[PDB]
Every structure is written in structure tokens, then in C-alpha cells.
């Protein structure tokens, strides 16, 4: 008689990688690197907030395009290509530090500055890029400093906020550069300007410097911000005879939460923990080749178009 | 290849068996007939499950963003992050490729060695009444029914009921 | 296991055995002994010695502070910093899991075949004088006493001199 | 009936559970830990010349606050910094301050060279203040001088101050700019006349300008003293055009060799020894990784995000 | 070694072998001669190829310098750059000597089963003609001239023609 | 009495130590090194359009400086730059010297673009000084101008120009503002009254004030000039006012910036240069130095890592 011991093959052997071959058949095998991508984001089981057109920035100054985003709770802020949070154009100081302090956050609470001045001294300015309600308007959260009376030097002021809370909150400001002296001298003076703000734990000189430059919006002129942290139970001065326009409100940031940079749609009737520009990675694998710019739980990048892992033995044919 | 069953001694697999990864075909006077083996291919895909299950995860770390991706931040510091996000996708990359290579060989060869095991299981129980062909078959020198050949494949088989007839039929 | 050994045709260790990894137990007509193979129990403490000695030490890399404990670090290099240790330590989690992983699968299939290399060191020395029990233990067919016993574990067996003796009880 | 004889491994009743490759639940005979999650509450400080400095924070040892007056100078390998130490006593900061002390850290000791800086008649070099309180009365700096003018209201002098470093190693010059809380303080010790303090050297330029302005009370002062520094090469003069607001060094700090530097809550330990530190102290393991903390300086473990990872040290356990 | 074949029951290698890796000394009537096997020689040179073909190689991976050769930079940035760069080289050197301990140690081993390999399908041919020496012999037991030989060799060894002659020795 | 057959493996008498992860002393038949311990000392130059600078600073080539005369314009695909390089030929540095720096050995090209001036008699632009030697005689920085007043000690006309960009591409412009050593040698040149200076563009805009105070004599002059730099954007005006550049400069593509101190060879191909010169293996790891520049074996602490080839070596 004859009994033989013997194993199972197939037809269609796909090939995998070992220490010893690069093109050895086996029976069954398996990706490890995922290729296919997702341009949506995935956002069930989360309190996200979409911004949109408001850049971070604009959520603590209050600009037009970011009225709804002053305040809120969340544990995901998302930001688009070209979101604008500037009216009146120039750039703020140490600009990208604030920003992804912000989408490091999980939400923006205000409190009020309690800032009063003069009867001689007009909080109201406005301009013609910000617009609120169809007309023109000013940030939500600062009041532009200017005397009421044309012509006439704007008096030295001393203000002082007080941080109350346990916590601390993020006081911004800001300092308008005009390129001229004929509207400069009449809303402020024709001296030459002092403004020199002073806490516990920062402090600082500013000039309003006047130079030649092409018109952005209508405007010839240029405004800049300048932010600090005030400490719990410490306190912010302000001295300035124009110049300054001091916040309304300051900031206080709430929690943790993911920050995502992209211009793809949102989807929640998906789940997802890694996202990138393109969108959503929602799979089980270990590696991935569609980005090395990615956040949250991510597969690892890695330069393979394909990695396969063999999941049964060599397949002998005839 | 490693244990020299698998592309080794058994000239070649059976596309006609399906069920199974290893196991028998018999030839007696009832004809020939084909049988699986439970315990050698559940050992080997269990194996398997258990590579798949460490392998196909992820880490549960948290990553911030260090790049703005619709602004250019400081030049120096952006080549500093350019410089390590290339270096550690050269090290995670290497490292893939080592991880499913080395995994690869492994799997290919604990599958030839679940076969060999099952083929020395065998061996050791027909004791003095079989011989071995030489391409993965035992010769059997005593008459063997369908219950002879199932004590064989259930690892039931008694070698000493045919021992005295199977010797004298080895001697000639 | 991978060598069939361990957890294999050798169906459970012994408890009872406190001076080796591997040894013998035989019954002749003098009663019962065992006795552990101190060469094979060698092998297998010495490469995991090897083990150890290479897996047990740190890297004298000399490192210095880049985060302060008691003080603010700038937002931009420390969320830089921040993503650079956590790549670092998931690489560093990863091989770690990886390098025992891969050596706790070598140092049990590295002991499997100590235990298989044993086996057919003694079936060698047995050569005719003997039959695989297919438990891993060798049924002899020549009256085999203590001094007998003794000289399969001191590897001094010389098989011709029972050989006579034992293939007439082989075969009858 | 047949002499047999039977080969056979050891095995144990109460056998180990380790993960391989294939299976996350094995048994086997032997196993030992290779990540560590025990650390020392001390700092293991034997054959090492090392300094605790206390609540002397190092910058403070270059200025010199009261604080660090036994620590203006020495030798070390290793140099331990306290939570909530002080460097400034009169309210004030250092641009590139992080920068600063991590290159005090990394040192070995530091030399202090006197400048020999001299002043006109009009100008009170003995500047002083309540916040620096040492021996009872009021004081200062011991490595810096406040310079005032003696006749309250009178504009400062023009004076121009240089130090050459006639040494072989470079030096660690630093100064401070003086920035008072109102233009009636200006005016009282300074006077009227625009103020410009101007430094320079072969390798360094920068002029600084006293901020007038409101602001909080620190130690009870409204004014400010901020802190610049630069390192003056073997041979090269550095030089102060200065009237008024400027903070005049007395004397100057060369930092030598290398010393190991530990920021840890941790009380020393001159017994036991290491060569592994972080905030809660030693770690004098054997092992390859730990899981204590991703912030340790000198020759570690790597940290790993794992409780345990068991090494097999003996065959698989098949147990009667 | 795992498979017990080299450094094992063959007690050395042959300096005289220069035509290949494993081969064969016989012993006759009509004197001695030695062939080398090429099928397991050519075996193991492709398997070293193919680790030499992945391990000697460099990622096509375009690295700037971050740090200035000629001049300073920002002393706290230098701090994190020379950090990062430790840690780097830290994973490199200990990724490269795991990658070099393992294949040496897979080399070694894949090495002692080609040869075991060999030594079992010599075992298979010859069946109940030859019985096994202890040191990687089989001592035939009928007149074995050089084509009888060569027939063992190149795999065309019918034993049943010399199995009669063979029997009648070996019971004696 | 039986006729024997014999397995056996081959051996050498001269085997190689190797490590596994079980031993330390492993001897096999065969194993070649993975570590390259042995570099040379030149910098391979084939299919490469290489530019050894020499004497010239990157920053000089942009700023004009006498040494870079022959380097003022060019394409490449590799720039090399050498010790005690001379980029300002009258004394100062850079604004993100290092950062400016990178985006020239970054950039495989530079494109230089007159920038089209003119001016009136009351300011003297074609300020020359005798720090930099020119054929002889004096001469000035090639692609900047001077701004100091017709007669010493006259108040400085506050003229004002502009320069448009008309280019597909990002155009970068350098402008040299003067530290005097003193208030006598400032009085001279821009006049005792007080001055600024200060740019604007649809992205940059910043103040600059002169900094006057006495200081060591650096190659002959205490006095200092520190240039400041800025791109502007396609379709955009650069405005600066002060109390002057007249040709720009553009970057050209990419390439590979090597920093050596090593001679360069006409028939050598390779893809990793040091400050050691080039490092031309086909193995994986090296020990040579972890600064490295192009495609590169990874850095290891390891002087050799010997890789088995063969089996265990056992002779008799
Ligand atoms: C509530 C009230 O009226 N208090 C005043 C009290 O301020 C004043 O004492 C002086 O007040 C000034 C300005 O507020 C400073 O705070 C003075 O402090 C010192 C200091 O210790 O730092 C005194 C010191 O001698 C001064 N030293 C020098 C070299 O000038 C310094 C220094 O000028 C300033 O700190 C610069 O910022 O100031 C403090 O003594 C007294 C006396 O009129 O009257 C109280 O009623
Ligand atoms: C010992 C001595 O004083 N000898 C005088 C000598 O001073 C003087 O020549 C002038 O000396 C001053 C002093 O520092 C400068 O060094 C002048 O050098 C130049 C320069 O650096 O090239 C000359 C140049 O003519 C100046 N620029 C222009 C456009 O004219 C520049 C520049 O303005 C400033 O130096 C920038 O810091 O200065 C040098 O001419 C002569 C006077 O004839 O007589 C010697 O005997
Ligand atoms: C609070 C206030 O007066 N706001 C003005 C604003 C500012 O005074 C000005 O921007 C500061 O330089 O100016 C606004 O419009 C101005 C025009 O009226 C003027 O003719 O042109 C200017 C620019 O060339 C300037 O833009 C503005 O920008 O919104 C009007 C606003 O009420
Ligand atoms: C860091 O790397 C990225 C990707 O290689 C660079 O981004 C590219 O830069 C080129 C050349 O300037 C641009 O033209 C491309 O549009 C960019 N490509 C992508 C995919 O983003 C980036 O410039 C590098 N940054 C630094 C500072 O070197
Ligand atoms: C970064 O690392 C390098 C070397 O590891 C340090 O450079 C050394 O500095 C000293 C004096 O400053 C020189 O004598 C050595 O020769 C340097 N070594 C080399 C190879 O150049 C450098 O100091 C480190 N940077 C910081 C910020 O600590
Ligand atoms: C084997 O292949 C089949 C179909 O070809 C597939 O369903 C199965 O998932 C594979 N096994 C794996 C990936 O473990
Ligand atoms: C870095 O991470 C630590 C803890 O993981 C956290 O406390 C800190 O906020 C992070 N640093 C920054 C600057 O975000
Ligand atoms: C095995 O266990 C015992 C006690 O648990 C110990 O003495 C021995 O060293 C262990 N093996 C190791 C740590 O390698
Ligand atoms: C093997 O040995 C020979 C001669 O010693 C040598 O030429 C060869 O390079 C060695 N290694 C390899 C991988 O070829
Ligand atoms: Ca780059
Ligand atoms: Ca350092």
C-alpha cells in the first residue's frame, strides 16, 4: 500500500519580500502600507467648530467674518486656504506662536476689560474695510482711541486690566501706522506720539512710524497687533496719548483640542482620529504613503508604494 | 526550504485540496482517496492570526501639527523640521521593510516545519510496518482498509497488530 | 514547537528535574534513575547569557537638557521639541516591542531544537539496538543495566557489542 | 518486555506569561523585565564635583544677586537648579534667557574678571535698592554697577567705557539697561537730554534706549532693570557709549569646561551613585528602557509607553 | 546550531573542498573520492545574495545641512539640533547592529539546515541499504563502485536493485 | 568492511569573527564590513555643474563685494562655499544671516535685475570706500550705492524711491543701513539732525534707526554697515524712506549646498560630500561624521559591524 503527506497551492500565487527573495510566490498575502485616501473630513463622537473664512486670529480681536466664533467650547477647530481676520491690512507680531496656540485650544472664553474713558475721549471709530450690518464698523473686542475734537493733542491715559481669574487670559492690542500727517495730526496730535503698555511679566516701547507704501483696501495706512498673557491675580497698564486702541474684552483658552488645516468638506456620519489637507485616514494598517504632514493618530509614513504581508506558505504549482 | 518539506522533499502542493493547508492521500486495494489534517493547519493559521493582531495596529500618541500648511514659517527652523520629519520617515521606513521581510521568512517556514512535524508524527507511529518513499509518501507493508489508513490520519493507528506480517513482508 | 520537540512529541516536562533543562529517565530491571545532560543544558543557558549580555545595557550617548522644568519655553521650537519626543519614543516603544518579540520566539525555538538535537544524538548512538517509542523515548531490545544506561548519557555506547543480541529480539 | 529509556526538558508549576511573535498569552520557565518603572527620590551626586546652587538660579550667579554670593565662582562637573530660584531681585528680565542658562548649565565651573570700569566726578556709581536687600541695608548686583547722577535732575555725562579681554578663552560680558516708571524718575536720576546707550565689539553691535511708561509694582518697584549679554573673543574689546540708564558691569564671567546640568526637586545623595537624572531624580537601572519620564539628561534608558515587556529566559513551561 | 548539522553530529568542515560548500567523501573497494553538491551550494550563495542585495544599500533621501560648518547659530536651537541628531544616530547604530546580529545569526542557521537537508535526502535514497554512522556517514552494506556512487550523488539510486544484497549483510 | 558515503561542508583555515545575538566570538567562512571607516580626501565633481566660491561669502555675491566679482551672477546644481570666506568687504552682518545663507546654497542659480535709479546733485550715491580694493584704485560695493551728502555736515535730503517687480517669480532685495563710530563722523554724512529709515510692501514693513557709538577698528574702519533684506511679491511696489540697492537679485530653482574644505576632482561621481570631502559607498551605514549633505549612508558610533557571508567556520 502508500499513504503521502502533502500541503495545499493555488493558481493565482501572489509574490512577496523575505530576507532571502524579492519575488517569492506564496498562497495568500496582505497590505501593511495604506495608499488609498479620504478627502473628507470625519467628525462623529466629536464637538468640532468649522470656522470657514475666519482665521484663528480674528476669534480674539472680533472681526466681522468671526461674529459667531467669539465664543465657544470644542475639542476641534478647523481652518481654511486664505481665511481672512484682518480689515484694515499689516500683519500681527510673533503671528504663527499665537495662531496654533489657538487650534491647540478647545474653546475661547471672554471676559470684559471694564475700560471707561473721558467724555473728551471717543471710544466709536470705525472703518471702511470692517463691516458689520451692511455699513462700516471697528473690532468687537478693541475701541479705537481718537479725541473728539479735530485738531486738538489727545491727552495721556493711563488704563489697567486685572486678572480676577485663577487662570490666565490673553490681552490683545494694537498700534495704527498712517502714511500720512494731514489725518494723523487732526485725530491724534502734532507732537509725536508715546505708547508704552507695562504688566509684571512683559513691557514695551511703541512708535507709530509713518512711511511711503502701497494702498491695501482703500487705505494708505497700516495697523499692527501686539499680544502678552496677564498672570492670575496680576494686572496690565496701559500709557499712551494716542495711538493705542486697547481691547474691549480679553481672551481667555479652555482645554485641549486637535488642529486641522485643510480645504476638504466635513462628513459626520463618519468617525476618523488622523487627518491631513487631502482629508480622513480611517484604516486598521500600521503604515501610510499619502502625507507626511498629518495629525492625531496617524499611521506612519513611509516611502513604499506597496508592502505585503504573506499570510500563508509557499505556493507550489504544476 | 529551513525543514526541507515545503518546496523540499514533496515535490509539489495540491491545488485540488481545499479545507485543509496539510494533509493525506492514500492508495489500497479500495482505491485511491484524499483527507485533511485539523490540528497541523489550525496551528499554522493560528500562527498567522497571531501576526496579524500585533501587525495590523497603530500607535494611540497624540500629534500636533509643527508646520503651517497655508503659510511658510522661519526658514532655519523649517528645514530643521524638514530635516528630522525625512529622517524619521527614512527610520520608519526601513523599518516596515525589515518588519514584513523578516515576518515573510518566518511565516514560509514555520509552515514547512508544521508539515515536517506532522509527517515525523506519522513516521513515529507506523514504526517498523511502512518505509519511506522519498517524495513525502510512507510504503506500507501489510494490507490497509479505509479504518487502517483513518487510525493513520486520526493518530490512533496500533503498530504491533501488523508488526510480525509487515516485517516478513519488508525481508521478503 | 518549530523543532516539534517541546510542546510537541515530548507531551509535558518534569517538574521533578532541578539539575538541568534537558535528561534522561529510564526503567531497566535494576528499577528507575534520571539524570540531566549537562552539554545540552549548556547550549541553551549560554546563548541565553548571549541574549542578555547583548539586550541588557543602554547607549553611553551623553544627553543634555533641550525643555526647561521650572520655566516657559517659546510656543513655535517647543511644540517642535514636543513632536520630535513623541516620533522618538514611539520608534524606541515599537523596537522595543519588536526586539522581544522577535528573541522570546528564538529563545523557546532555540530550547525546542537543544531538545531535538539531544534526541537524535542518543537515536544515532542506539543505531539497530533500538525503536522510536514516538513519545521521545527508545525501546531496547538487549538487557541494558545501570553501567549500561550510564554509558548512552556519557555518549560511550559502542552499539555492535548488544547489536546480535538485539536484532534477533527485533525481529524473531 | 523491553529496557526503554525516555528524553525529557525541565518545567516548574508556577511558570511566566511572555508575548512573542505569534502569540500574546505564552508560558515559559523564566523571565526577567527589560523596562524599568522604579526611580530613586534622590539625586546620586558620589565621584562627582558637583554644586547645588538652592534658590541661586545660574544667571544670578553672573549678576549677582544676594541669593548667589556663594556661588560667584568655582569649579564642577555637575550643577543642580532648584523650582522657583531667583536671579532677579530688582523686578527686570535677559533677552535670550533660555539660551542663557542652558549655556550656564552645560559648564564646569565659572571665573569672574574685573573690568576696572572708572567714572566721572558727577556720576554716583553706588546706585542701590530695597529689592536687593544684603548685610541688613539696601544694595545691589555685586557684579554690576547702577550709575546715577549725583546731582538729582543734572544730565548724566557722556562717558565711554571699554573692557579687552587679555585672557586666551573668551568671556561672558553682560550689562543691564535701567528702565524707570515714570518721566519724573527719568528726569530725577538721569536728566532731560535724549538717552542712547550704545554698545560694541568686533563681533557685536546694539543700542538700547530706557523705556519711560506705567506698569505694576515687583518687590515694590515700578521700574525695570532687563539684562543683555554677549561673549567677548580672546583679544577683542568691547565698548559702551553710554548717558545714562546703563547698568555697567564691575566685572565680567569666563564659563570653563563641561559640567552635566539637572533641574530636579530631588535632595542630593553623596553614597549612592548615577549616571541618569530628571525632575524626580536618579535612575540606576541596568536595563535597556523605562517609563518614568521623556525629559532625563546624561547616558539613559530610552523611554518607552510601555508598563512591562517580559524576556524569556528559559523554554516554553509544558507543566505536569 | 538549531539544526544540529554543522559545528553538531559533523564534527568539522573540509579545507580540501574548493569546488563548493557541501559535498561528499566516499570510501570503496576501489578506493576514495569527493564531490561537492552544487544544488545546496548554489541554495545558500543565492539566499547570502539576496540579504547583500537588501542590507548593502542607502535610502534615495536628498539631506541640507541644518548647521553651518564655518560659523555659530542660535545656541539653544544648536542644543535641540545636536539632540535630535543623538537621538538619530542613537536608533541608527542599535537599528544596525539588531539588523547584522539577526541575518548573521539567520546566515549561520540557514547555512546548518542546507546541509541537513542534503544529509536527509541521502538518508531517503538509500533506504534499508545504509545505516547512519553518528558523524554524518552511512556505512552501505553491499559493494558500492564510482558510478554507484554518482548514481547516490546526482539523485538516481534505485536501492531495491542492491536491497536483497543489502538485507542479507546487514542481519548477518 | 561496509563501504562508507560522508557528508561534510567546506571550511578555511583564516575565518572571520562575526556577532549573532547569541555570541559575541562567532567565527564564520566569510563576511564583508557594512560600516565605511575610510573616506578621500577630494570633492567628487562629474554630472555636476559645481561652483567652488573660494575667497567669495554667499552673502558677498548677492552684495558686490570685490571677491565676488567672477561668482556675481551664474546656474548651477551645487554650490560649494569655503573657511574664512569674505562676504562683507566693509564690516557687518545679516538680518537671518544664516537663514539668507540656506535659501542661496538651497537655490541652484542666481539672476541679478537692475532695479533703474536715478537721482539728483544734493546726495552723492557713488559713495566709494578704500576697504575694498578694485583694480588699483577705490571702488564700492557693485550692486549697491552710498547715501551720504554732497557737502559734510549739510542736512540730507529725504528723498524716497520705488522699485516695481515685474517677473513671473519672487524677487529678493538687500539695502545697506550705516552705523557711524561716533557723532563727528555722523554729523559729516547724514547731517546732526535726527533720521530713520523704514520699507512697505503688500507683506513687509519695518522701521530701522542708525545705531552711533564708538567700537573696535575692524579691517580698518570702527565703523559699521549692517544690510537688511526682504522678497517682494509679482506685481508689487517696494517703498523705503530714509533721511540703495541699483540692481536686485533672484534665486534659480534648487541644488545641493556643500560647505568643504576639501579640493575638488574632474572624473569623481558621488551623492555625499562633509567637510571632509566625499563620501563615494555602496554600504548602508558609516562612521566618518554625522553633518552630512546629500543622499547618505545613515551615521552609526561604530568603527566596523562585520556582516557574515558564509557558514560557521570549524577546522579540524
Ligand atoms: C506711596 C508713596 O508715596 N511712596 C513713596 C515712595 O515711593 C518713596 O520711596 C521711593 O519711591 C520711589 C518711586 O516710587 C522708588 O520706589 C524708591 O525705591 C528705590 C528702590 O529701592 O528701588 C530707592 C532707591 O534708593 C533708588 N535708587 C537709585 C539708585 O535711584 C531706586 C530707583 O531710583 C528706582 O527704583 C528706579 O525705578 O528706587 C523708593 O525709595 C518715599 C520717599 O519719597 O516716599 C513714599 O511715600
Ligand atoms: C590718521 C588719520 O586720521 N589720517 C587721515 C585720515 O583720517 C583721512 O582719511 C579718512 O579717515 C577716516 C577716519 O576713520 C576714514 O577712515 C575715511 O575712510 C573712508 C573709507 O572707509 O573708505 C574714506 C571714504 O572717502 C569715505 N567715504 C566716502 C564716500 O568718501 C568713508 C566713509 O564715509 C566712512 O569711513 C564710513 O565709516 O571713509 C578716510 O577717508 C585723510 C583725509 O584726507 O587724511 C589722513 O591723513
Ligand atoms: C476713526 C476714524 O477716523 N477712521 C477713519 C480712518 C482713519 O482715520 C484713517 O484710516 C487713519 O489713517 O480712515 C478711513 O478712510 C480714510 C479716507 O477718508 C481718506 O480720504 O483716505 C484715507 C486713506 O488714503 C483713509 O482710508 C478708513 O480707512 O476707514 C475712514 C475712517 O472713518
Ligand atoms: C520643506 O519641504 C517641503 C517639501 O519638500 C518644501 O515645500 C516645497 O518647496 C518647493 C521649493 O521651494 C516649492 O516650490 C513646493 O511648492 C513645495 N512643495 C510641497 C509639496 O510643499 C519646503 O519648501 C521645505 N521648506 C524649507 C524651509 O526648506
Ligand atoms: C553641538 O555639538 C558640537 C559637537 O558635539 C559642539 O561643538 C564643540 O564645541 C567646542 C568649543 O565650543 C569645540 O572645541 C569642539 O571641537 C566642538 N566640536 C565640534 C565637532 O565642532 C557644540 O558646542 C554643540 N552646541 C551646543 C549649543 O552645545
Ligand atoms: C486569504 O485570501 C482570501 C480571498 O482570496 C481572503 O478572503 C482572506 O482574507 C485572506 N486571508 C488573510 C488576509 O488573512
Ligand atoms: C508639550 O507637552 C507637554 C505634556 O505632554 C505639555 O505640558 C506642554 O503643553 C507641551 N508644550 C507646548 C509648548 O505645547
Ligand atoms: C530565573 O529565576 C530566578 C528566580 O526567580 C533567578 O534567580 C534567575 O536569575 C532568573 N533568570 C534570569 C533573571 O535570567
Ligand atoms: C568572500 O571571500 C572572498 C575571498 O576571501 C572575497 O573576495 C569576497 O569579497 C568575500 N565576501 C563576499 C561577500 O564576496
Ligand atoms: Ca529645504
Ligand atoms: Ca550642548
Known sequence: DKICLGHHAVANGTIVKTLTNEQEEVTNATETVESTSLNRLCMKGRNHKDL????????????????LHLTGTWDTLIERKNAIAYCYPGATVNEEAL???????????????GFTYGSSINSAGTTKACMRNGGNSFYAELKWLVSKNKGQNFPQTTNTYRNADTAEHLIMWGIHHPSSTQEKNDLYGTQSLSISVGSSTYKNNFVPVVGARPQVNGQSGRIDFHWTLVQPGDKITFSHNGGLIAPSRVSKLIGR????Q?????????????????????????????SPRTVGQCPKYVNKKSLMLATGMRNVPE | ??????????????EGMVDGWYGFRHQNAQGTGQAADYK????????????????????????????????????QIGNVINWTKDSITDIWTYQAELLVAMENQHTIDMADSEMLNLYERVRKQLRQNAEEDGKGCFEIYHACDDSCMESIR???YDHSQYREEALLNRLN
Open chain 1, 52 to 67: 470657514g473664512n475666519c482665521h484663528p486670529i480674528g476669534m480674539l480681536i472680533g472681526t466681522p467674518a468671526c461674529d
Open chain 1, 99 to 113: 495662531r496654533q496656540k489657538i487650534m491647540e485650544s478647545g474653546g475661547i472664553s471672554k471676559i470684559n476689560t
Open chain 1, 257 to 260: 483640542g486637535l488642529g486641522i
Open chain 1, 262 to 290: 485643510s480645504e476638504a468638506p466635513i462628513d459626520n456620519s463618519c468617525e476618523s482620529k488622523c487627518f491631513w489637507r487631502g482629508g480622513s485616514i480611517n484604516t486598521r494598517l500600521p503604515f501610510q504613503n499619502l
Open chain 2, 1 to 14: 526550504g529551513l525543514f526541507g518539506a515545503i518546496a523540499g522533499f514533496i515535490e509539489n502542493g495540491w
Open chain 2, 40 to 75: 497541523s493547519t489550525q496551528a499554522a493559521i493560528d500562527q498567522i492570526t497571531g501576526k496579524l493582531n500585533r501587525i495590523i495596529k497603530k500607535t494611540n500618541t497624540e500629534f500636533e501639527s509643527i508646520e503651517s500648511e497655508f503659510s511658510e514659517i522661519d526658514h
Open chain 2, 154 to 156: 486520526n493518530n490512533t
